Amino acid sequence: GLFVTLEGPEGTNRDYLAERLRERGIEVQLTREPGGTPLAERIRELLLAPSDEPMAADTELLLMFAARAQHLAGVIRPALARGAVVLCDRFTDATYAYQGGGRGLPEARIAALESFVQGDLRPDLTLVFDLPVEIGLARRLDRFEQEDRRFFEAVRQTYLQRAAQAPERYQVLDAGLPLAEVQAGLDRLLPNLLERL
């Protein structure tokens, strides 16, 4: 199967992409992180709540990876195994962007967890939906949404940087464009997928 993740700055396209695949006789598994199983979604809710006790940064990183571990076991690996295209909303790039760029944790700490949790499993293709920080935010606020501008700017820039450095694994789309244009960019990227598959 094929492991596709969708990323971008904080703030529809996925449904269009899935139906293009389904039309073409492909099984599609839609999912999201942190999340995607009952336990993982319990971890989600602890991560996103604007709780009176500030969550330590290492706690936040560990919980993102603990939800990822569960989801990989229960959802992602099984789907890949039966030949599904997984379209996962956010994955370890978001960890690099949010926890590394935004929060300031060392890229090295994230890399060591990525390897521990995932083995050699990486996304086959990562779609980065790029747009200006304040547009994204416009699209109640969770703990990450309540963040300051530099945090979001560092998120945006981390995604562009990671894509620049491994261009074969990433496509960056302009997500600020009108919807019809964004869908056309999705249609333009399908031949490559039918082919990685």
Ligand SMILES: Cc1cn([C@H]2C[C@H](O)[C@@H](CF)O2)c(=O)[nH]c1=O
């Ligand atoms: C998958 C993932 C998501 N996030 C953030 C981005 C959203 O604000 C929120 C829910 F997806 O969690 C994050 O900070 N790190 C991650 O690894």
Ligand SMILES: [Mg+2]
């Ligand atoms: Mg959000």
Ligand SMILES: [Mg+2]
């Ligand atoms: Mg802040």
